[PDB]
Design a binder for this molecule. Structure first.
Ligand code: HEM
Ligand code: HEM
Ligand code: X71
Ligand code: X71
Lengths: 454, 454
């Protein structure tokens, strides 16, 4: 009933089958399909997620108009997502004057001042990591990064948000550790063909987040809420905040606590895994980086907030990895008005998509796009890089509110880990890595590596 | 479109509201509503579960026609239940010539011969129970029965079916113990008003059993299948069985393994909890029973299969409890034909229901129906009891296939428990017990009791 939309505006794309759209083209994952499309169709193309049209753009100025310029006016919300139940009040899912109300009420939690106030705490679990690694290093036993990294990222989230202190790797059976550790699978494809069936599940209290984990943290939060009240973390600042322009409700407060936890668990863990792979497969880079760390932190000195930003080959290494594996893959915004941006009409209701993964591997802005070369981000060459071709944290008012915290969380782990250990591939280590043909930005085979002690 | 069905046949009942039916009358639970209806309307009445008519019968001969006589011809299947995914092949859910095919292929597992072959095994975990109770008995700390009883019933199921041996109470964090321990809640009411929405969830692979626990046991079973093949329990006999009239498939085999596990976990545990309450609130009965046990098993002798059936005050105690709390509450069968049984027309499609709980408390067949008096089942008075008024295990071809195993499982626990401990109520012990106004036959407040050692 709408599969003729791009044929009308003269916008190219693959031919959508009825009802399915082009979702059968996802057999190789969003990334390979975007790379193919960006290659076949050029600067702008179109396709249909079921009955839903999606438009892809690759011009730095047009992306800037959508993410930055016309964010408030036109492109304010991401693609609708459901069923969710009470999770409607979550920021990344919120919309319009209820997003602007929440993005404000929670921005003060990622300031340089508060972020520096978390340096003594995040550092405490970088140490706990070393013991868990050294126990498996002295017992030569190849190591799965995501396991031990997940336990660390888990340990940092909990502390930085609620104060609950657990050695999740050695307490994988703690009642607070279990609950926590929990788009092309059989369900979500049925959602994109049956978006008319989402409202059924919403009057059903059925949620893609199980109704159990949430109810454990609706109460675990209100336990801690009444445990510090009255008697430095994310929640101590979210309680200080409810003390535009209505204050923060309490089921509203329980919702954002959850979104941070995923945000910083599988992403802090996944990215650190993509990094230790690149170091293990480019040991020269691992050499140059351990030299820089011990030059800023001699005698294995403890990283501080001001020493972390001081490490430049560290930032270069982090950036280049994110180019190769930008965990979001795509950036998306929903167009709320008949608007003509940068000389092109965008009708109301169209999802606007930026293919981040494909753009990070576009040879027109990247020489040797699939090799690992941190030298792209040296202060020498870091200036020929369009800020709208490279967006691992998005851009504009709706970008990643936790970016500063993520770059600080990961670099405090890399300093403390690379001060002590070094990483060599295994025989059973997948060289080279194959990306998941599925729906998340993750490896086909989990990253296994040999670990030795300095 | 069908709410005029009972008005037509001249059958009385509460007035159904559009779409909801009489389900708003479930605010006091199925039990209180059936008692009320049986009291207001007499021997036969009618009501609507949404758009679905249900007919209640209370005559011994008419129940016998449905459960026993015309089971094969007319009343073969229970009320349709979904969504379920692959669990369609489960016996209690199976229908017609695929139930008759499965009820046969699995009946040989509850014979007196095989049941006696499980006596040495089930006895091993009655002992493990004592230590866990004595640890909390020597530390005077009131005891929650369902916790420790659940761990025991759990320990017996696993062993009697797969051989996996765990102290689930002290291993509540065993990867095999966790998966296992998992009708008027917000969901199932939406199902009975929206039965047209079930087929949506079936093409969605959404199942009221989470798609996770099942996939752990589709593989855990096929681990054990290829671990004994090649190298006494339920599965060793289900593999021996696939060695009417097609053999047992392997996803067919994974399904029945699950249905036994619930069947014998929350029911073996719940019933033993309703029993220890009745003993604690009628200590004279507890006195008479410990005398009988030590008279059959002197010196705290180990129960055997032939000593267990020998205990008559034990059976009396078990029976009378089940009268007071018959965990099924109702028996149901779906009518597949225009039939006129015992002088009454039953049109096609009508669910036929027997109110077991209400009938167990009907003063016309029970003197002092709400008191606890095991003497109703003494060999003296046990003959004035209609086998179709008292059906804790159902009746006829479709009755509880595991009845013999349940009466043997529980009595082996009561002998070993009452040989050693005695049970007194607490202050915080709920005297008298309030039944759950909800959907399962369970207490409002979990049973807590003081435990002392002989
Ligand atoms: C390697 C680490 C991370 C990366 C690469 C990353 C990337 C992104 C990206 C690309 C977006 C979408 C931005 C857009 O649409 O323009 C986003 C959104 C978001 N991120 Fe992250 N993220 C990371 C870690 C975190 C962490 C640790 C948090 C902790 C709270 C967090 C919280 C959020 C939130 C709340 C949003 C939604 C913002 C909004 O809609 O206003 N992220 N992130
Ligand atoms: C206190 C213990 C138990 C009680 C009171 C009980 C009661 C019942 C009742 C009333 C029914 C329905 C019968 C009917 O519709 O006429 C039933 C069915 C069933 N029970 Fe139990 N049960 C118990 C324990 C068990 C156990 C331990 C198992 C182990 C496998 C089991 C397996 C089954 C099965 C498979 C069915 C369905 C039979 C069929 O549809 O063919 N039950 N039970
Ligand atoms: C794809 C379509 C168009 C159908 O729907 C969307 O696009 N929905 C996206 C994600 S759905 C739900 C998600 C939270 C969640 C998902 C699964 C298990 C547990 C929690 C969310 O609510 N928020 C995600 C925030 C966590 C995060 C991830 C990466 C970086 N930083 C933070 C929304 C999204 C937000 C941010 C980046 C990328 C996507
Ligand atoms: C009420 C309407 C009319 C809508 O649906 C039905 O009546 N569905 C009944 C039960 S639903 C699913 C159930 C299994 C199950 C349920 C919940 C969590 C885990 C597993 C089953 O599949 N089987 C139950 C067998 C276990 C058992 C319980 C008690 C005694 N022995 C064995 C089916 C039923 C079977 C047997 C007795 C009472 C009810």
């Amino acid at each position: 009933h709408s599969h003729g939309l791009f044929k009308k505006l003269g916008i190219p794309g693959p031919t959508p089958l009825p009802f399915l759209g082009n979702i059968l083209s996802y057999h190789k994952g969003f990334c390979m399909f975007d790379m193919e499309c960006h290659k076949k169709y050029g600067k702008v193309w179109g396709f249909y997620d079921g009955q839903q049209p999606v438009l892809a753009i690759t011009d730095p100025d047009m992306i800037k108009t959508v993410l930055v310029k016309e964010c408030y006016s036109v492109f304010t919300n991401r693609r609708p997502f459901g069923p969710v139940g009470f999770m409607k009040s979550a920021i990344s899912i919120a919309e319009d004057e209820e997003w602007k109300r929440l993005r404000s009420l929670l921005s003060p939690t990622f300031t340089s001042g508060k972020l520096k106030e978390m340096v003594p705490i995040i550092a405490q679990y970088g140490d706990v990591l070393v013991r868990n690694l050294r126990r498996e290093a002295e017992t030569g036993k190849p190591v799965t990064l995501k396991d031990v990294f997940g336990a660390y990222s888990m340990d940092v989230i909990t502390s930085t948000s609620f104060g609950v202190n657990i050695d999740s790797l050695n307490n994988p059976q703690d009642p607070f550790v279990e609950n926590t550790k929990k788009f092309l699978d059989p369900f979500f494809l049925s959602i994109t063909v049956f978006p008319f069936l989402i409202p059924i599940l919403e009057v059903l209290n059925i949620c893609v987040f199980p109704r159990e984990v949430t109810n454990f943290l609706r109460k675990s939060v209100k336990r801690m809420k009444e445990s510090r009240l009255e008697d430095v973390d994310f929640l101590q600042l979210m309680i200080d905040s409810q003390n535009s322009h209505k204050a923060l409700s309490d089921l509203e407060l329980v919702a954002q606590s959850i979104i941070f936890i995923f945000a910083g668990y599988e992403t802090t863990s996944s990215v650190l895994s993509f990094i230790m792979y690149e170091l293990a497969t480019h040991p020269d880079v691992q050499q140059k980086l351990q030299e820089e760390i011990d030059a800023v932190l001699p005698n294995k000195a403890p990283p501080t907030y001001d020493t972390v930003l001081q490490m430049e080959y560290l930032d270069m290494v982090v950036n280049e990895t994110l180019r190769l594996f930008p965990i979001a893959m795509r950036l998306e915004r929903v167009c709320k008005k008949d608007v003509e941006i940068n000389g092109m009409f965008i009708p109301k209701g169209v999802v606007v998509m930026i293919p981040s993964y494909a753009l990070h591997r576009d040879p027109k802005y990247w020489t040797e796009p699939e090799k690992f070369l941190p030298e792209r981000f040296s202060k020498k060459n870091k200036d020929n890089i369009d800020p709208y071709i490279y967006t691992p944290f998005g851009s504009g008012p709706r970008n990643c509110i936790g970016m500063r915290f993520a770059l600080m969380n990961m670099k405090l782990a890399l300093i403390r880990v690379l001060q002590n250990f070094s990483f060599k591939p295994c025989k059973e280590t997948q060289i080279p890595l194959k990306l998941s043909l599925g729906g998340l930005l993750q490896p086909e085979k989990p990253v296994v590596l040999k670990v030795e002690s300095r």
